[PDB]
Design a protein around this ligand. Structure first.
Ligand SMILES: C=C1C[C@]23C[C@@]1(O)CC[C@H]2[C@@]12C=C[C@H](O)[C@@](C)(C(=O)O1)[C@H]2[C@@H]3C(=O)O
Lengths: 434, 146, 334, 109
């Protein structure tokens, strides 16, 4: 088994391999002492490291290269009168859970009256939550602006591109299945990086799936035409094919017109879309089974690191309150503009759908890394550790804006998290067939 | 082999054969033959021709230690504006890469660190931009002013 | 071969891995490879749910400089359910409760408040001491040189002193003990010296292998050079990345008992407990600091460790860990 | 009385900041400021071990909007904290991804 003291210390070393680890450490020590600073520079900049917690594999890779639950809360000083706000809000939630409606309405009015005189992000989140509670009582551009004013989508896109590119080395025919095409702001970077590779850009096939058009439009066609024009301007082959579907449970491995895997690699992408499917019983297992039938080489998953699928209403309400108050706090240094206001509207719709709605209509059921891990590992899927290059690119991304203040990136168990200081917010990971 | 060069005014200069190959235009003329009398250079001043003659002669003599040439070409550039411009034009005309490189490096060094105020005083040029376009270009390069 | 006989296998492996990782990372120019350092570091997250009688949460004290700190306090006996977010700032119960303001090491350029090793150390301190612990996250050199860390510590101390939920019935004041390890010892000493002439009364200091230096090489650096996981080159590199450019190791931040430094005699300074590891290269400087404190007229207790190396307080599988913890508990609960 | 090519030869041996400052003095200097060779050579001054040929990078950058925007939009903010720091392959990848995304944004269906 594992050494207990090392395990709590934060390292994964087997008890039966301690002597081997020490011997490898001493050999690495002598090898580094033999070489000059050139070897140190080579390991500092040229090489990459995977899964630093596994000391055995990390040391072996270094030797080969040299010689070829849990809840997190952060408090903010700007809570002079917020204590009464949380008191009233939790009282209203409990009263809602206690089949009492008149008290809930009175408490909603009290929250409104108290938030009238408040000044801060507390005011905004309290107003949105009060509106959500009013909607619950009564029943008893978005993404572009969010992308432009928040770093979540950019970080997710760049980490996904790095993972896919690292998984697409030494291949001549590639194919990408995207479960959320959206606006296609991620693929230009991937195609530009694949154009400047070492060996020549291979054939690039893209198959996208998106939600049905509310106004019966051809957004997928426009995105495909734009991407084809960009590919022509970059001199890379490109085949595009767009699909319309209400949910991912109706897909099939034979309806995608998949070419044989022995002659072409397949990569599946997903960004903030796998949690909208947990509301329907049995859908996620079928989607994972069809992914297994696809037999891809990589599966990129980006989610929000918070538990919002609890059976108890009050628990979900509390943790969602704290997560969204942290989110609204993290958006105070951004200067005022229409983008900021419209993204607060986006987050308000987020809160309203998460709180007021119930049943299969509610699609906003997030989960943390652990449960996703057991869900993926029940179908024969193994993890795939990311490297330090993605970490560094994410660091530069977060350093482009606000002088790199507040938001931090961390690694754990082969996955990356972007968060406000020490509070994880977004988790990105990669999986493969076992 | 001795080569006679004739200037615009009428002065005659005597040059050698190995130095002639330094000017690749003269070498290209030579490999095509059809050269018996002195090659005339119409649009070239005599003193500039003498200066470039001294430069090329010194360079070939030194080539046949780096600090010595660095100091020599440093001492060469003790000429004013007019001689510098004439030498640049001559180096363009007879196409000597080293002399042109040195003159352009010297002029780039003396324009380094200047402002849109200092350059106009340095070269005595006329500012032909209207206040609107001048403000526009200043705003475009406003990062350079902080 | 000498190191494998003094410390157990697990501590040897851990310290060797740390030394190798920091060695692949040091730059002769003076720059710091921050990104790979952050990637290789192991961190943890706060857990408000009590785990073995200890829970934790983060507080953002300052926003201009992103000054953050983590608070550990014992589990509530009267609350069977896990404490709520509103219950996090509950006033303390007990006639006298001490709070420990803790500073971590890393030669001013490594580790963080939310690092796994210091999280475990603070949890064990809370469990054995039965006290509240505040771990400060100060800025790290060389991107943020002197005097950023002292300002961060001063702001954290002012924040801790001004709280109303960490108070005592007996005298209506706060019982603050400053503690630090490695670089934290220097930070704690400087903050205590600053606060002595400011109004905030400090109860005691707990220094675990304090970091102090000078130009004159001592008799312990030569014999122990590179034999117990610590060499001299790293010492000069770290001291160069800290002090202002164009300064030697006789700066007051490097050597408090320097001709340019202020004399401690005639000034207020709390009692201190200095723990010195014998088999470390900076033993002589630590002993010199202890004797300077003794000669200045301030109370100081020396705990000379005969056969202990650096990082002896990271695993409980040795015998000196228990002695140090017992001595600290006796020192604070006096 | 300077001609076009000689001004290019002069501005060849000048740095980025001085070239930007001299882009404003006069119209001829302004025209000689935007030639892509000068900004290409300025951009490829702190790049080592890129891993790809210069011709392909030049063609792609020209297709995506030129080297002037590449320098003045992403490279300068990156070099602002530490001016004396060489940019590896990762900074190039990030900057090129940002430029391609911007070109995708600005272009019409
Ligand atoms: C270069 C260094 C610096 C070490 C000693 C070492 O030789 C190896 C790594 C550092 C360190 C890591 C964690 C602990 O805080 C420390 C006191 C130790 O034992 O080892 C740390 C200690 C220190 O920061 O002084």
């Amino acid at each position: 088994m594992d050494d207990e003291l090392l395990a709590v210390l934060g390292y994964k070393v087997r008890s039966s391999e301690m002597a081997e680890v020490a011997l490898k450490l001493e050999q690495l020590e002598t090898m580094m002492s033999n070489v000059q600073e050139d070897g140190l520079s080579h390991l500092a900049t040229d090489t990459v490291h995977y899964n630093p917690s596994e000391l055995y594999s990390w040391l072996d890779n270094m030797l080969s290269e040299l010689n070829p639950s849990t809840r997190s809360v952060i408090l903010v000083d700007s809570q002079e009168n917020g204590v009464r706000l949380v008191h009233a809000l939790m009282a209203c939630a409990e009263a809602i859970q206690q089949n009492n409606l008149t008290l809930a309405e009175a408490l909603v009015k009290q929250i409104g009256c108290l938030a009238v005189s408040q000044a801060g992000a507390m005011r905004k989140v309290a107003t949105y939550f009060a509106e959500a509670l009013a909607r619950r009582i009564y029943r008893l551009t978005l993404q572009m602006h969010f992308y432009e004013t928040c770093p979540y989508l950019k970080f997710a896109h760049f980490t996904a591109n790095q993972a896919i590119l690292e998984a697409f080395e030494g291949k001549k025919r590639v194919h990408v299945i995207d479960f959320s095409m959206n606006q296609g702001l991620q693929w230009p970077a991937l195609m530009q990086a694949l154009a400047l590779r070492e060996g020549g850009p291979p054939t690039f096939r893209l198959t996208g799936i998106g939600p049905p058009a509310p106004d019966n439009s051809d957004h997928l066609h426009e995105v495909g035409c734009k991407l084809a024009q960009l590919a022509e301007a970059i001199h890379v082959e490109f085949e595009y094919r767009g699909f319309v579907a209400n949910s991912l449970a109706d897909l099939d491995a034979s309806m995608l017109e998949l070419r044989p895997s022995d002659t072409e690699a397949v990569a599946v992408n997903s960004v903030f879309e796998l949690h909208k499917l947990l509301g329907r019983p049995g859908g996620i297992e079928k989607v994972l089974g069809v992914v297994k039938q696809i037999k891809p080489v990589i599966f990129t998953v980006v989610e929000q690191e918070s538990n919002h699928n609890g059976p108890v209403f009050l628990d979900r309400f509390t943790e969602s309150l704290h997560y969204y108050s942290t989110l609204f706090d993290s958006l105070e240094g951004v200067p005022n503009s229409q983008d900021k206001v419209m993204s607060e509207v986006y987050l308000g719709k987020q809160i309203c759908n998460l709180v007021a709605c119930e049943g299969p209509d509610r699609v906003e059921r997030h989960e943390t890394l652990s449960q996703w891990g057991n869900r993926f590992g029940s179908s024969g899927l193994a993890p795939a550790h990311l490297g330090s290059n993605a970490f560094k690119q994410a660091s530069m991304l977060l350093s482009v804006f606000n002088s790199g203040q507040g938001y931090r990136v961390e690694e754990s168990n082969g996955c990356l998290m972007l968060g406000w200081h020490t509070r994880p917010l977004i988790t990105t990971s990669a999986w493969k067939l076992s | 082999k001795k080569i006679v060069l004739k200037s615009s005014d009428g002065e005659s200069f005597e040059v050698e054969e190995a130095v002639a190959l330094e000017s690749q235009t003269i070498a290209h003329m030579v490999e095509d033959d059809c050269v018996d009398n002195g090659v005339p250079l119409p649009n070239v001043t005599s003193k500039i021709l003498a200066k470039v003659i001294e430069y090329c002669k010194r360079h070939v003599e030194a080539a046949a230690s780096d600090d010595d040439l660095k100091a020599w070409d440093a001492d060469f550039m003790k000429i004013d504006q007019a001689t510098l411009f004439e030498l640049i034009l001559a180096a363009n005309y007879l196409n000597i890469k080293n002399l042109l490189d040195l003159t352009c490096q010297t002029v780039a060094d003396m324009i380094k660190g200047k402002t849109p105020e200092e350059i106009r005083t340095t070269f005595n040029i006329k500012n032909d931009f209207t206040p609107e376009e001048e403000e526009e270009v200043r705003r475009e390069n406003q990062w350079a002013f902080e | 071969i000498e190191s494998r006989t003094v410390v157990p296998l697990n501590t040897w492996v851990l310290i060797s891995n740390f030394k190798v990782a920091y060695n692949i990372l040091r730059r002769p120019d003076g720059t710091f490879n921050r990104h790979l350092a952050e990637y290789l570091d192991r961190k943890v997250t706060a857990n408000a749910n009590p785990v073995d009688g200890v829970f934790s949460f983060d507080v953002l004290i300052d926003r201009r400089i992103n000054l953050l700190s983590r608070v550990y306090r014992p589990a509530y006996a009267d609350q069977e359910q896990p404490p709520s977010i509103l219950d996090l700032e509950k006033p303390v119960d007990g006639d006298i409760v001490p709070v420990i303001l803790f500073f971590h090491g890393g030669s001013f350029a490594h580790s963080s408040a939310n690092s796994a090793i210091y999280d475990t150390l603070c949890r064990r301190l809370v469990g054995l001491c039965k006290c509240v612990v505040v771990s400060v996250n100060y800025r790290r050199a060389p991107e943020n040189p002197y005097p950023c860390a002292y300002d961060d510590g001063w702001i954290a101390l002012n924040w801790v002193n001004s709280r109303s939920w960490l108070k005592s019935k007996k005298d209506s004041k706060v019982h603050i003990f400053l503690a630090g390890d490695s670089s934290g010892g220097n930070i704690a000493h400087n903050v205590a010296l600053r606060a002595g002439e400011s109004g905030i009364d400090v109860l005691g200091n707990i220094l675990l292998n304090p970091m102090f230096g000078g130009n004159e090489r001592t008799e312990s650096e030569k014999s122990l050079d590179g034999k117990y996981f610590v060499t001299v080159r790293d010492r000069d590199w770290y001291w160069k990345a800290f002090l202002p450019e164009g300064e030697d190791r006789e700066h007051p931040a490097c050597n408090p008992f320097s001709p340019r430094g202020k004399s401690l005699e005639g000034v207020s300074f709390p009692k201190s407990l200095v723990v010195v590891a014998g088999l470390d290269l900076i033993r002589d400087w630590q002993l010199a600091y202890a004797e300077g404190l003794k000669k200045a007229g301030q109370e100081v207790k020396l705990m000379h460790l005969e056969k202990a190396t650096v990082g002896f307080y990271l695993l409980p599988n040795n015998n000196h860990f228990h002695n140090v913890m017992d001595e600290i508990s006796a020192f604070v609960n006096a | 009385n300077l001609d076009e090519n000689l001004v290019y030869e002069v501005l060849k041996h000048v740095d980025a900041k001085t070239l930007a400052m001299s882009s404003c003095v006069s119209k001829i200097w302004h025209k000689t400021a935007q030639d892509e060779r000068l900004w290409e050579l300025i951009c490829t001054r702190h790049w080592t071990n890129i891993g790809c040929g210069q011709n392909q990078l030049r063609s792609v950058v020209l297709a995506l909007g030129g080297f002037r925007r590449l320098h003045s939009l992403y490279l300068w903010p990156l070099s602002k904290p530490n001016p004396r720091a060489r940019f590896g392959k990762d900074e190039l990848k990030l900057t090129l991804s940002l430029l391609s995304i911007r070109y995708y944004k600005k272009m019409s269906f």
